[PDB]
């Protein structure tokens, strides 16, 4: 069960990973 934050079903290796997503999620 690979993570899957909702934001392009890119799921992620890791929840690490997933931030640095994230800086691209809202324009942080």
């Known amino acids: ?3 899957t934050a ?3 079903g890119r799921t ?3 929840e ?3 931030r640095d ?3 691209t999620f ?3």
Do not use: A, C, M
């Open 1 to 3: 069960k690979p993570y």
């Open 12 to 14: 992620f290796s890791n």
């Open 26 to 28: 809202t324009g942080r």
């Open 21 to 23: 997503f994230l800086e």
């Open 6 to 8: 909702r934001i392009k």
């Open 16 to 18: 690490k990973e997933l």
